[PDB]
């Protein structure tokens, strides 16, 4: 099951309250496989704490390594249901504008054919 399917809203909110207490400089992000994607693998851990200074292109490099991707394997992130406005956008800005009601920032990843047209 996906994260939201496994945890109730109240449990998600409490997860966020506690984790943000414990990690004063990290953003809580859920990073899951796009439903329908079957080239890229599933992560063993899909709950992340991301240093709050990074930008999206830094995060992409990290998640490609987490997935142990080859260089010839395409990867794209959708953040809160849309493509990233820009790879240079700080994750602190992304969190403030795109976070869920529950306090997590949600993303999914996909390969080229699954992701489709990029504009």
């Amino acid at each position: 099951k996906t994260f939201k399917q496994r945890r109730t809203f109240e449990q998600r909110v409490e997860d966020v309250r506690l984790i943000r207490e414990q990690h004063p400089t990290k953003i809580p992000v859920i990073i899951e496989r796009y439903k329908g994607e079957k080239q890229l693998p599933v992560l063993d851990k899909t709950k992340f704490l991301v240093p709050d200074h990074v930008n999206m292109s830094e995060l992409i490099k990290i998640i490609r390594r987490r997935l142990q991707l080859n260089a010839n394997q395409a990867f794209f992130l959708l953040v809160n249901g849309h493509s990233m406005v820009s790879v240079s956008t700080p994750i602190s800005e992304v969190y403030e504008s795109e976070k869920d009601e529950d306090g997590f920032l949600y993303m999914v990843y996909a390969s080229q054919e699954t992701f489709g047209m990029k504009l």
């Binding site: 994260f3 496994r6 984790i19 990690h23 990290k26 809580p28 992560l43 063993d44 851990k45 899909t46 709950k47 992340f48 704490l49 991301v50 240093p51 990074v54 830094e58 990290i62 987490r66």
Partner: peptide, 12 residues
């Protein structure tokens, strides 16, 4: 899948 994966600066 309940434990968080912590990204650190030593990775950047």
């Amino acid at each position: 899948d309940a434990v968080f994966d912590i990204i650190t600066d030593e990775e950047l």
